[PDB]
Amino acid sequence: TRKTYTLTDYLKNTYRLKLYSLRWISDHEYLYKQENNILVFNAEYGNSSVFLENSTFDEFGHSINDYSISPDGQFILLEYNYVKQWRHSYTASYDIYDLNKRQLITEERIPNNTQWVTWSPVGHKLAYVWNNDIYVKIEPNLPSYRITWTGKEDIIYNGITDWVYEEEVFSAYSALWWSPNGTFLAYAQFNDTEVPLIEYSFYSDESLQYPKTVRVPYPKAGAVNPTVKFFVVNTDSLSSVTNATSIQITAPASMLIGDHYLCDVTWATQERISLQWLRRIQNYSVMDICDYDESSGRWNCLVARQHIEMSTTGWVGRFRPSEPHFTLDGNSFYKIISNEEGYRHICYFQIDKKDCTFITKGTWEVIGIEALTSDYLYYISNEYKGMPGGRNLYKIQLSDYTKVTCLSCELNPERCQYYSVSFSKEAKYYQLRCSGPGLPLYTLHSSVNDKGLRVLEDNSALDKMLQNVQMPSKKLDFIILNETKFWYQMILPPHFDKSKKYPLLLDVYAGPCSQKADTVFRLNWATYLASTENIIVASFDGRGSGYQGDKIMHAINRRLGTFEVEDQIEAARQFSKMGFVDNKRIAIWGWSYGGYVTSMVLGSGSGVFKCGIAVAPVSRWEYYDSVYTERYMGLPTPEDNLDHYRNSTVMSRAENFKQVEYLLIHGTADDNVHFQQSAQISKALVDVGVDFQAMWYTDEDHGIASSTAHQHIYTHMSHFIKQCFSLP
Amino acid sequence: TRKTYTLTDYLKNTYRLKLYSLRWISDHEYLYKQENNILVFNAEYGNSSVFLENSTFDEFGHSINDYSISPDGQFILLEYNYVKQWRHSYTASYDIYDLNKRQLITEERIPNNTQWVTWSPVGHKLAYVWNNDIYVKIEPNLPSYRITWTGKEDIIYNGITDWVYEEEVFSAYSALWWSPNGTFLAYAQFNDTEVPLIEYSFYSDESLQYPKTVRVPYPKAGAVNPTVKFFVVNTDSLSSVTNATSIQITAPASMLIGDHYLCDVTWATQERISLQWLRRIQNYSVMDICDYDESSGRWNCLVARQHIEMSTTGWVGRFRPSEPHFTLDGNSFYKIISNEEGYRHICYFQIDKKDCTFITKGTWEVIGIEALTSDYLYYISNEYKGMPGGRNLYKIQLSDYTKVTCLSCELNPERCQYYSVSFSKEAKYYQLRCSGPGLPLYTLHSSVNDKGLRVLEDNSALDKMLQNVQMPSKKLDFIILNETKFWYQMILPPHFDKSKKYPLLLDVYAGPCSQKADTVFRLNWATYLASTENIIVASFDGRGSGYQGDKIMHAINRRLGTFEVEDQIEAARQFSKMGFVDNKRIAIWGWSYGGYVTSMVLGSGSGVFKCGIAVAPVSRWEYYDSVYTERYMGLPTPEDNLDHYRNSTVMSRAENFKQVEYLLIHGTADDNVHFQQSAQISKALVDVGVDFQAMWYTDEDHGIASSTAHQHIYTHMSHFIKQCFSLP
């Protein structure tokens, strides 16, 4: 009898998915790591050479975390002493290696405790942030030029984001943007002077006698937000003037009237930059298009080139206004925007005309614009077979919009329905990355003729291993509720028999723009639960879910903890109606927003669920950050939406927890969803005399991602689910 | 059939022990609160009068927490707006009511947020501490005289203790000592300038958007300690025009050479004060005897009047050097000290003579000196029947030490083997309080011929209630380890059958000078476990336990987490071999030091225990306070005892928990045993891949004593023990 996919298989990564991570260095070459060696590949022929031997840094004295080759291929930036901070941020030591001289640069070194470093996009200039100030090095062995003198720990951030901008706005620590040829360096400055601090203990190693108090400027819903300014400096002037001026680009008057955010920075040309600003009430955004004025040395943003993007039904963008993709001359751009029917499509703008032209349309959505050439625009969408959980690459002819080719749809339709893509520097080649429903498949293609050059990684080694395992299957389908299709997925036990009643676990995210029903192949906890424990693991995309238009996505506008919660309860009722579910053994679990939804469901008094697990849940919207929370909730004030902020807490439902078995889990060093959120849930349960199970994870953050904690959490949860379902 | 004593009975206090809390006001009368009225009783006859009617403050407008009648009976101090701080500390507002003119005093009121207040021992003067400074009121309606001007929150404490002195030295917030007739006011000043802060989050009500960080000067083992100064002010020479002069009494040279503590303050006469000082290495203490010099207005401590108390086997005193009991003229005193055999007995000292004479001797110990007259000294000891867990009142004739009379031994030997006593002002009367093995019994006695005047409270109502309940029994006995007798107790289920095998729970404290095997009657969680669940609840006093001499008590000197842990394992091993114990179902639990011992036992690899629960455990001695830890452990330095501090952690034993079921519980706002201690245990268990159960209690302190958290913790622990023992 074939073995099943066990918890130890999941925890020890016995069945490993192979990836094919390449780094394009030009229009026809990419770097790839094979046995610690960095190889350089010719995309056209597939032949390779050793770019940098695995022995090169044996006597370096430090474990090299990562590398970055300069665009001109003359130098390599070596990253070591990697100290992780938030989701994207970290600090590190850096050394530069001269590839021609085959020697390490020992003079004018990048200082220790550097926050961020980036090469210019052409050549080998460097911009780095140290002690919250910006520095530029024209040459790697030459002294740096200081750009800002205002940097102040937890107060003034130059060229790096504060906590909330990193997590919720830029999805990056960097707040610097080199112009295309590296002449200009644009950057943002954040001022957190009056932003309140979240404070929590950090225990550290057992040797630390007194716990440390971590203090982070973090605006919770309705609190004082950071303020922002934007500047551009001419880096070519640095060696000629003692102190090059950083020219400020001010936000438009429509933004200056109140609290706002800088939400996008995109260079259009060597002398034209676009900025998108967003009001604190995130249903109004403005794009400014600013030109360098050679005579005054200033940047001017013509009101005739200003573009407004607003929403009457919700917020702007999926998580923020989309980025523009400029034509070469910078006179027009393409941008994903919500059309009249509420579907996200590509609109084509002239920089000085306010009405744009939709180039795509239909009851499906464009996910992202991937590449733009003089002849074609390449994008990913879920158009294929009307499956919102599928992803394919398309090519649209710019001279004729009726000419739209699906590049990936028919390559392997049974195996591959979810693609991402990586184009070479001037889109001469593309790597397709198929991630499901079959095993991931990595392929290389030439853009000149859309022909498949070769298979880079087909996961044949894993396919051979999986043949000896009783793997679960995955069903992706939909149910019709109020004449609307709502998609779901089920991870089904091997030898699934519709005449048997199986215990069911509802795996929840359900946040705005979430998508838990898709065609991706995964080897995860659900794989073990279905394979070894014979539990069906189901997910459902209800109201508030993404990629299906604004009628569905904006259904929870100003009303988090309502329809998306009710729809999970209804999903379990619908799954019961299917006949293969044991109604006495329905559980629910989720992490982060999924933990908030799980807790709201367990506290609903629905009687549908026996038990559930909430990991790092939000419990009260006033505890979560301003940028995310307010996007959907507005402000927690009597004039705005306070009544709903107060009505949508987990704590108010404490009495209903007497009806369920609950396991509450949270990392003590969670900088994102503060441990406070679970500490308030537990106190409310204690106050009404509800027994429940709890687990804190010392010094673990939002991901509970350390090797040991990850294994511990999944082991603890597996015992809990098995006990709930009376499984030995 | 009759009911058992249930978990709800314990949690809802269905069966209440009645008390008889009186307050002696003279040599012949006492105050007693009855039906919210305050009565005054004549001790000779038992007749009473209403002192204060419960209706007097019906229009007060504030809920009165407590009352304090001035020694002359003219005024009543009304305590309200009580806000608890640590174990003894709190702030409150105060009003004074004139009992003669039947009016509240509205002039010169004691301020709000007052930290401590006390009447003089005679008359009606008041001394109070507000904002860390001392104030004196000669008359309740008159303006206060400010005594100190140096008081500073968390830095300078005048007349109040800091965290460590409150918890570990004085067992009180007060650091004020009035002279016998109220002429002088002695006080200590603590300086915490360089003492590190323990910091932890406090979540508060759900309405608090950002958690607060509590910061308390708290010296962990080996850290910088507070410094102390001692002063005496004459309250009879205070001026409205001039600032009060405080006369400092400096510590002897033997103390000033290094870190030290003030550990006792005891007035001998109107003009003589005794002070005891302890070195930071707590095996050397010095008493100074200081006399007021009318001529110079100074306090002089003659070197010929110094008394050294040292220990070669351990620390000095049970938890600190004992208090002296001075004679009427103050020329001699009686003090409990460890004799040459290591047994604590009463020694008689002359103020100017080095050698003291022991007035009691034997293989038993004096617990406390209770009263002293020119003819007799009254004391509590465990002499009777050689039972260290029993307590009786004795008197010793001062003119003939061979004449020792037991005053409580024979009153009711079957019901009463554990007494405490309260004597009237000049020991003319005494109240005996019997607390077991039977129901508590309160009686009143006259000293002249030791007449048993009357029964004050006999708990006959509770006896009637308990007749309809299947109550457990208690067995108190001993086992012999290495020719030494060590006592244990077992709470046995009702209808105990020695032919049946019962699961056993070992209830542990086991700290230095602990005593868990005694004759006290208790209605607690163990009562329910035995009565309803049929579990034997055992406790054992092994090496390090108290009241049995230093050979046993000092066995753990410099070696915490050694013999006291081994001895708990040995006792359970011995109990496991008894025919009435199920060796497959032995559990262990404890709180605080008991949580440390439980965890050390569970991590020992003994294999004796199936499961256990640690509540607020110490996990590493370097995390606990200096005063308690160093008393037993010395300093955590390589030259002193660092190796043993490092070898005695729970964390080092994490791998051994693989074979046990462990439940770890801790309050997040524990200012005493910081949450950090359990946070380090859980991280060590996660690091070795050991599954365990956990529960944090939001905002609960060391006591986890709020009504809802108390019910929740005992509910959660009951489920855990029942699951461990396969009990439905």
Ligand SMILES: CC#CCn1c(N2CCC[C@@H](N)C2)nc2c1c(=O)n(Cc1nc(C)c3ccccc3n1)c1nccn21
């Ligand atoms: C409170 C909120 C929110 C919402 N959120 C967002 N937002 C946008 C980005 C910035 C973020 N601050 C807010 N991205 C989200 C979510 C969300 O809750 N999940 C669920 C989830 N599930 C699992 C198993 C997780 C496992 C480990 C760590 C996090 C996990 N999180 C999620 N899964 C994939 C993406 N994301």
Ligand SMILES: CC#CCn1c(N2CCC[C@@H](N)C2)nc2c1c(=O)n(Cc1nc(C)c3ccccc3n1)c1nccn21
């Ligand atoms: C860490 C340490 C120590 C030692 N400690 C001391 N010391 C002397 C006084 C000052 C204190 N800081 C140190 N008195 C102690 C202990 C101790 O651990 N217990 C056990 C225990 N049990 C139960 C059910 C408890 C229930 C709630 C709260 C505390 C509990 N504590 C104990 N019981 C009665 C007295 N005491």
Ligand SMILES: *[C@@H]1O[C@H](CO)[C@@H](O[C@@H]2O[C@H](CO)[C@@H](O)[C@H](O)[C@H]2NC(C)=O)[C@H](O)[C@H]1NC(C)=O
């Ligand atoms: C991939 O193969 C091609 C063809 O062999 C290499 O192209 C160059 O071809 C010239 C002939 O004019 C040879 O002299 C060289 O060996 C090649 N140039 C360089 C700069 O290496 C090509 O370089 C190969 N690429 C890799 C990454 O190995």
Ligand SMILES: *[C@@H]1O[C@H](CO)[C@@H](O[C@@H]2O[C@H](CO)[C@@H](O)[C@H](O)[C@H]2NC(C)=O)[C@H](O)[C@H]1NC(C)=O
């Ligand atoms: C960051 O923002 C703070 C205000 O939150 C600015 O601080 C003020 O600076 C002015 C000088 O122009 C002072 O008069 C005020 O006393 C300051 N206010 C506070 C609340 O500190 C600060 O100047 C800004 N810093 C930068 C570099 O923009």
Ligand SMILES: *[C@@H]1O[C@H](CO)[C@@H](O[C@@H]2O[C@H](CO)[C@@H](O)[C@H](O)[C@H]2NC(C)=O)[C@H](O)[C@H]1NC(C)=O
């Ligand atoms: C470079 O120029 C900047 C911009 O004028 C200087 O920054 C000013 O510095 C002084 C204090 O020394 C203050 O008057 C201003 O508030 C600063 N403005 C900003 C935007 O920082 C900076 O000090 C100059 N550097 C050198 C080396 O002269």
Ligand SMILES: *[C@@H]1O[C@H](CO)[C@@H](O[C@@H]2O[C@H](CO)[C@@H](O)[C@H](O)[C@H]2NC(C)=O)[C@H](O)[C@H]1NC(C)=O
């Ligand atoms: C990259 O772009 C910048 C901006 O267009 C170029 O700098 C300009 O060069 C032109 C000549 O072609 C002059 O008219 C201007 O004085 C320059 N402007 C500034 C602001 O420096 C720059 O030459 C380009 N760099 C490279 C290496 O091609």
Ligand SMILES: *[C@@H]1O[C@H](CO)[C@@H](O[C@@H]2O[C@H](CO)[C@@H](O)[C@H](O)[C@H]2NC(C)=O)[C@H](O)[C@H]1NC(C)=O
């Ligand atoms: C104790 O606090 C109370 C309340 O803050 C003070 O009592 C009066 O209280 C009213 C409102 O309850 C206020 O308008 C006044 O400021 C108070 N004044 C007087 C003269 O009573 C009170 O003063 C405080 N007690 C002391 C002794 O300072």
Ligand SMILES: *[C@@H]1O[C@H](CO)[C@@H](O[C@@H]2O[C@H](CO)[C@@H](O)[C@H](O)[C@H]2NC(C)=O)[C@H](O)[C@H]1NC(C)=O
């Ligand atoms: C309490 O004791 C103090 C100190 O012995 C007494 O004060 C002394 O009283 C006599 C008067 O009979 C004077 O000769 C001394 O000068 C006083 N000494 C000081 C230090 O003030 C006082 O008699 C007693 N007070 C009460 C109220 O009984």
Ligand SMILES: *[C@@H]1O[C@H](CO)[C@@H](O[C@@H]2O[C@H](CO)[C@@H](O)[C@H](O)[C@H]2NC(C)=O)[C@H](O)[C@H]1NC(C)=O
């Ligand atoms: C008080 O206890 C200390 C620590 O045990 C005793 O210290 C001595 O000094 C160190 C310990 O850190 C060792 O070098 C010696 O072995 C100890 N000296 C001896 C045993 O003579 C100190 O002696 C104790 N004091 C008393 C009065 O017994």
Ligand SMILES: *[C@@H]1O[C@H](CO)[C@@H](O)[C@H](O)[C@H]1NC(C)=O
């Ligand atoms: C980084 O720190 C180390 C040791 O603390 C030092 O030897 C080295 O010079 C530092 N590097 C730079 C670039 O300052």
Ligand SMILES: *[C@@H]1O[C@H](CO)[C@@H](O)[C@H](O)[C@H]1NC(C)=O
């Ligand atoms: C933005 O949202 C607020 C709150 O719903 C609303 O009052 C305002 O009219 C909105 N703007 C648009 C363009 O709908």
Ligand SMILES: *[C@@H]1O[C@H](CO)[C@@H](O)[C@H](O)[C@H]1NC(C)=O
């Ligand atoms: C008790 O009775 C005596 C007389 O027998 C009386 O003088 C005394 O004041 C009474 N005491 C109380 C407290 O009522």
Ligand SMILES: *[C@@H]1O[C@H](CO)[C@@H](O)[C@H](O)[C@H]1NC(C)=O
């Ligand atoms: C408290 O102690 C510090 C040294 O830690 C000293 O500088 C300061 O003067 C002291 N304050 C008082 C009032 O004694």
Ligand SMILES: *[C@@H]1O[C@H](CO)[C@@H](O)[C@H](O)[C@H]1NC(C)=O
């Ligand atoms: C008393 O002492 C304080 C603090 O030193 C001072 O500020 C105040 O003026 C003094 N009062 C008199 C009457 O000397």
Ligand code: NA
């Ligand atoms: Na009697």
